[PDB]
Amino acid sequence: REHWATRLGLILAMAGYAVDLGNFLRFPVQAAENGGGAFMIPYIIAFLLVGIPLMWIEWAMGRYGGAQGHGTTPAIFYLLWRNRFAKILGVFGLWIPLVVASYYVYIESWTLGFAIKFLVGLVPEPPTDPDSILRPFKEFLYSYIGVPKGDEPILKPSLFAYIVFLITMFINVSILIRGISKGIERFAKIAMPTLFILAVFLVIRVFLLETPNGTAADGLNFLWTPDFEKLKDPGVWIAAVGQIFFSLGLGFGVLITFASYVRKDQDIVLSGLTAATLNEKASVILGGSISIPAAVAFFGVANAVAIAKAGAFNLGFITLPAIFSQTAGGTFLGFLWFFLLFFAGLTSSIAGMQGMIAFLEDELKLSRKHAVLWTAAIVFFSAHLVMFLNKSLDEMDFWATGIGVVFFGLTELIIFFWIFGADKAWEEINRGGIIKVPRIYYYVMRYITPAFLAVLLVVWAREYIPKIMEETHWTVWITRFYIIGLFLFLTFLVFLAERRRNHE
């Protein structure tokens, strides 16, 4: 079985996964809408009661399973719990990241495409007024995606967008086919530094932004000034727990798979806590210093609320490109910005797609080459639903992310710590640990963490399901049809996996 070559490379791969577009876009938007600096109170709390505990647990289950040659949850859940159901529950952690890959790698391709379009200067050049500057870029993006101009829910992506998507897929395969060490780890050692450099460079450039409408200091002001009155809202405390979950990448079965390449007695306590810290630093220091400030600097603090309510997607693909077109040498900035995003995704997409590679290797005894190619084949095929069918992307995101993560995490907690036994689990976490987990975290992992995840479940159940189930167009059933079909298909492979083992 493959293994991580260097302790550093492990942390950089793990952090590479956690650091993504969410760091630079989603996190700054969530903070501004939920108390600003006051949002740090429920965010840090969720990081300590839910994020950190679950991080150690997925690392634990991973290494525990990796020692026995199994990187995926259909096998691992069957080692913690020896039930027919546990294999089935485990399919979700094989199903979830495969659904994400079905649309993320594509979104990742956009950044690459925009990065190229900006580097060669093939971008709109306005013209004055905000809607006169944004619209050429709002339309620039829509021509790439192929946003429907009619009542039809049909996307028509440009030939370029499709070709970049193919190139992007190819790039992923290139790294993935070289294995864990000479591929993922080797790239994590290049990507993360390059990522940091670009972030700092952009940060410095943004602080020097001065327009008649405001400055970057106005952006850091609006973002970090604390509105404690919003801490009364449960929704802020829900968004915080959700964000931490989302930022660390919990519930996707990616940490589990990655940590299964960690050797049996190697540290996971300190190593995980490090990678988790790298992610958070990137979010508050780098990410919160580029997007929101620059937006406020150019449009003034007057629109800072309107900008934040415009969503993370608009901020990153319409707003920020439009601002760069108005700055000295801004075409290059667009290139640095999109190339910054590109790597941030590429370091996550190679992680997300490793779970399916691992399964085919571990359970179906496929070579790494075959396991990589077939995984690429599945993702490429399924993506056409995202590329061509409007709002398919959102349906996959909704189900996979939302439910998947919350439900799976709570499943991971119960199986490992309640079913497999808390004491056996706690030892599994602290074993080989450079530092030991604080004795108080035993109670957090056993009660506080699943309580949070459960209240999150209930709130989530009440607010978002009734919405998607009735008010959405009928075409969502196509996406539902397909993502259900995937789960059935993955059930079947798991079935074939166990039938092959009884023979040998």
Ligand X SMILES: CNCC[C@H](Oc1cccc2ccccc12)c1cccs1
- Using alpha carbons, select from 276, 356, 288, 305 the residue that is nearest to residue 47: 276
d(CA 464, CA 373): 36
Copy the structure tokens of residue 176: 């993935």
Question: Least Å distance between CB 381 and ligand X?
Answer: 15
Decide whether 373 or 419 has the Cβ nearer to ligand X. Answer: 373
Q: Are 270 and 184 in contact (CB under 8 A)?
A: no
d(CA 313, CA 42): 24
Segment near ligand X (CB under 6 A), from 57-65, 146-154, 245-253, 329-337? Answer: 245-253
Q: Does position 252 bind ligand X by CB under 6 A?
A: yes
**Residue 353 contact, options ligand X, Na ion, none, Cβ 5-8 Å cut-off depending on partner type:** ligand X
| DSSP symbol at 227 | -
Q: Does position 254 bind ligand X by CB under 6 A?
A: yes
Decide whether 53 or 300 has the Cβ nearer to ligand X. Answer: 53
Binding test (CB under 6 A) with ligand X, winner from 25, 38, 55, 101: 101
Decide whether 47 or 417 has the Cβ nearer to Na ion. Answer: 47
Decide whether 390 or 401 has the Cβ nearer to ligand X. Answer: 401
Helix (H) / strand (E) element for 234: namely helix 234-248
The beta-carbon contacts of 335-338 under 8 Å, at least 24 apart in sequence, are: 335/115, 335/118, 335/119, 336/198, 336/201, 336/202, 337/118, 337/202, 337/290, 338/111, 338/112, 338/114, 338/115, 338/118
**Residue 349 contact, options ligand X, Na ion, none, Cβ 5-8 Å cut-off depending on partner type:** ligand X
Question: Least Å distance between CB 213 and ligand X?
Answer: 32
Number of residues near ligand X (by CB under 6 A) = 19
Binding test (CB under 6 A) with ligand X, winner from 86, 100, 307, 476: 100
Other Cβ atoms within 10 Å of 332 Cβ, number? 15
| DSSP symbol at 20 | S
Q: Does position 444 bind ligand X by CB under 6 A?
A: no
Q: Are 25 and 221 in contact (CB under 8 A)?
A: no
84 labelled binding-site residue: yes
d(CA 395, CA 401): 10
d(CA 412, CA 218): 43
Contacts of 279 (CB under 8 A, 6+ apart): 15, 18, 19, 23, 247, 248
Question: Least Å distance between CB 393 and ligand X?
Answer: 10
Segment near ligand X (CB under 6 A), from 319-327, 344-352, 382-390, 410-418? Answer: 344-352
d(CA 296, CA 114): 23
Question: Least Å distance between CB 100 and ligand X?
Answer: 4
Decide whether 81 or 399 has the Cβ nearer to ligand X. Answer: 399
**Residue 347 contact, options ligand X, Na ion, none, Cβ 5-8 Å cut-off depending on partner type:** Na ion
Binding test (CB under 6 A) with ligand X, winner from 42, 51, 97, 287: 97
Burial class (CB in 10 A: 0-12, 13-18, 19+), 504: exposed
Binding test (CB under 6 A) with ligand X, winner from 53, 71, 352, 450: 352
Q: Does position 105 bind ligand X by CB under 6 A?
A: yes
- Using alpha carbons, select from 412, 403, 420, 401 the residue that is nearest to residue 449: 412
Segment near ligand X (CB under 6 A), from 93-101, 116-124, 189-197, 432-440? Answer: 93-101
Decide whether 140 or 245 has the Cβ nearer to ligand X. Answer: 245
Q: Does position 72 bind ligand X by CB under 6 A?
A: no
Q: Are 325 and 334 in contact (CB under 8 A)?
A: yes
**Residue 23 contact, options Na ion, ligand X, none, Cβ 5-8 Å cut-off depending on partner type:** Na ion
Q: Does position 395 bind ligand X by CB under 6 A?
A: no
Residue 215 backbone dihedrals phi, psi, to 5 degrees: -130, 175
Decide whether 100 or 276 has the Cβ nearer to ligand X. Answer: 100
Return the residues of window 7-46 that contact ligand X according to CB under 6 A.
17-18, 20, 22
**Residue 344 contact, options ligand X, Na ion, none, Cβ 5-8 Å cut-off depending on partner type:** Na ion
Binding interface with Na ion (CB under 5 A): 16, 18, 20, 22-23, 247, 279, 344, 347-348
The full DSSP string for 268-294 is -HHHHHHHHHHHHHIIIIIGGGTHHHH
Residue nearest ligand X, CB atom distance: 352
**Residue 257 contact, options ligand X, Na ion, none, Cβ 5-8 Å cut-off depending on partner type:** none
Three-state SS string over 421-466 comes to CHHHHHHHHHCCCCCCCCCCHHHHHHHHHHHHHHHHHHHHHHHCHH
Decide whether 21 or 268 has the Cβ nearer to ligand X. Answer: 21
**Residue 401 contact, options ligand X, Na ion, none, Cβ 5-8 Å cut-off depending on partner type:** ligand X
d(CA 392, CA 18): 25
Q: Does position 347 bind ligand X by CB under 6 A?
A: no
Residue nearest Na ion, CB atom distance: 347
Decide whether 250 or 308 has the Cβ nearer to Na ion. Answer: 250
Q: Are 55 and 255 in contact (CB under 8 A)?
A: yes
Decide whether 25 or 133 has the Cβ nearer to ligand X. Answer: 25
Task: Show binding-site residues for phosphocholine.
Answer: 84
Annotated binding site: 84
Query: Would you tell me which residues interact with ligand X (CB under 6 A)?
Result: 17-18, 20, 22, 97, 100-101, 104-105, 246-247, 249, 252, 254, 348-349, 352-353, 401
